[PDB]
Design a binder for this molecule. Structure first.
Ligand code: FES
Ligand SMILES: [Mg+2]
Length: 569
């Protein structure tokens, strides 16, 4: 598609956009403001870099990003350019998890994209350096870069370090699990409170291979971050050094005029996907990479993810699936060492251009390989799973697609009577009151999609409640929303069409025999197509849960999960 969104420049000029306001006499107003903010006449000749951080104080993932932003600005000035900082909003999935505040999470990606697009366009900045630090922030910044197509680099804020106390390790997942362990009797209240005080020891994104590190790693593999960006910890002095170098790299991108639509291509999108499959990355990457692909006028379907999943084995022994965390990847050569191995295996396209001004292959020629003896990244001949974790399922109940994380440890089939709930809350009340009624069932939590939720909330409490009741492998879990963790069993999200839109998931009744088949890739119902059609004629959409504000705008704008929940088409 031909993307028309933002202003064109008015060709070896480095100030292609800012010249619109710095050069003409008829933009004297603009120049007056710029003198006011501290620019000399000589400064007006230089390129202007929009430096977009997602700093805020109330989240560990984001509290350090103002300091990083200052270091990016200093490096832009050291590279002979003007650096102009601005800052957008973000939200904390870790804070808002288990609450209605989670309805505002996914849409913050799209709000972030709109924010950066807005400032870059209005202020006529020539290039962008973005400093996201948390889940949704990362793709939001890349989407903005794709829309604008101005030279850009994403500096990942970096991963949090695991907490340590009295020779035990903790992360955010320890803190989530602590409640269930207390209720079951596995730990005391004092041990519970100890976990909370030592789970998050400083700044940076959640530590394992959840969405932040998945997306950071993916975006490095896509060529839109500098080498090591995804693997250097937040509090590591090298992160600050990377910040101070971004300016030098971006200067070179302006000389080359190497733009996001030159770097983000079908092949580099594939490279990103390869990294998700190899590292055991989150199912959320499906939504985010589709959104990134659309931002540059390219197509990316659920089927494309299945093909890359089938082609690429799961190799990384990393949480949540495995043992180690993102800090351990840093110790054995970082993300470049991982990607170097995948390139040597023939799994990636080396000729894709990157933000270094060189190709992926060129970047990876000159990096140390995975440390001899390391046990984190398995060899090709002994993978953790022969294909990727990410599985696309269709069938009667998800005719437009759905996404699941499949380890290989759960078997190929599950069949059981449907147990249907109209939101998360009613599911949690039922399993609390009568846990044994869930045994052998296919649990359906519906009305939690993009429009129905609203906001397509991510839900953790259902899987942990199932685990806490001892029913992990003894029931399946289906939703039009999203789930956070694995149940050691069949857990499917992103079911399309969502129940709010009258998809078959909205027509399921209690007792319907639902059969999940992984080999066939189908979520089927024993109810006849005719009886499902009769139910469809009786069905009417429930009223929207909001009538005003940002979530009502989301309801009006958002596309399906199968289309990456894009809001601007
Ligand atoms: S709440 Fe920020 S990456 Fe988890
Ligand atoms: Mg999340």
């Amino acid at each position: 598609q031909s993307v028309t969104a933002d202003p064109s420049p008015p060709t070896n000029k480095l100030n292609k956009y800012s010249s619109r306001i710095t050069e003409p006499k008829s933009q004297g107003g603009s120049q007056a403001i710029l003198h006011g903010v501290g620019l000399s006449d000589d400064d007006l000749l230089k390129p202007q870099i929009g430096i977009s951080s997602v700093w805020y104080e109330g989240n560990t993932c984001n509290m350090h990003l103002l300091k990083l932003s200052e270091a990016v600005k200093e490096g832009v000035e050291n590279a002979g350019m003007v650096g102009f900082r601005f800052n957008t909003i973000g939200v904390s999935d870790a804070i808002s998890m288990g609450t209605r505040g989670m309805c505002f999470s996914l849409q913050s990606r799209d709000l972030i994209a709109d924010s950066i697009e807005t400032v870059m366009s209005a202020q006529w900045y020539d290039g962008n350096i973005s400093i996201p630090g948390c889940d949704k922030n990362m793709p939001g910044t890349i989407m903005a870069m794709g829309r604008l197509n101005r030279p850009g680099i994403m500096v990942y804020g970096g991963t949090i370090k695991p907490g340590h106390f009295q020779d035990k390790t903790y992360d955010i997942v320890s803190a989530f699990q602590s409640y269930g362990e207390f209720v079951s009797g596995s730990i005391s209240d004092e041990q519970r409170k100890t976990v909370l005080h030592h789970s998050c020891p400083g700044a940076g994104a959640c530590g394992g291979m959840y969405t932040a590190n998945t997306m950071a790693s993916a975006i490095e593999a896509m060529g839109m971050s500098l080498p090591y960006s995804s693997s250097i910890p937040a509090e590591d002095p090298l992160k600050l050094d990377e910040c101070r170098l971004a300016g030098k790299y971006l200067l070179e991108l302006l000389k080359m005029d190497l733009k996001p639509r030159d770097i983000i291509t079908p092949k580099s999108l594939r490279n990103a996907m390869v990294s998700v499959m190899a590292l055991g990355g989150s199912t959320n990457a499906v939504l985010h990479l589709i959104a990134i692909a659309r931002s540059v006028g390219l197509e990316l379907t659920l089927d494309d993810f299945q093909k890359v999943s089938d082609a690429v084995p799961f190799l990384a022994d990393l949480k949540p699936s495995g043992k180690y965390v993102m800090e351990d990847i840093h110790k054995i050569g970082g993300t470049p060492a991982v990607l170097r191995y995948l390139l040597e295996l023939g799994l990636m396209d080396g000729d894709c251009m990157t933000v270094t001004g060189q190709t992926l292959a060129q970047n990876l020629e000159n990096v140390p390989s995975l440390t001899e003896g390391q046990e984190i990244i398995r060899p090709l001949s002994n993978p953790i799973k022969e294909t990727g974790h990410i599985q696309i399922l269709r069938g009667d109940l998800a005719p437009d697609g759905s996404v699941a994380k499949i380890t290989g440890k759960e078997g190929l089939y599950f069949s059981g009577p449907a147990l249907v709930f109209e939101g998360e809350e009613s599911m949690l009340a039922a399993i609390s009151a009568d846990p044994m009624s869930f045994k052998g069932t296919v649990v359906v939590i519906r009305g939690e999609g993009p429009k129905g939720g609203p906001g397509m909330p991510e839900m953790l409490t259902p899987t942990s409640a199932i685990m806490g009741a001892g029913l992990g492998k003894e029931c399946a879990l289906l939703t039009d929303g999203r789930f956070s963790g694995g149940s050691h069993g069949f857990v499917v999200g992103h079911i399309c069409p969502e129940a709010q839109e009258g998809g078959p998931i909205g027509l399921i009744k209690n007792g319907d025999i639902i059969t999940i088949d992984i080999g066939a890739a189908r979520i089927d119902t024993q109810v006849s197509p005719e009886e499902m059609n009769d139910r469809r004629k009786k069905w009417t959409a429930p009223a929207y849960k909001v009538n005003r504000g940002v979530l009502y705008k989301y309801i009006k704008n958002v596309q399906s999960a199968s289309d990456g929940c894009v809001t601007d088409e």
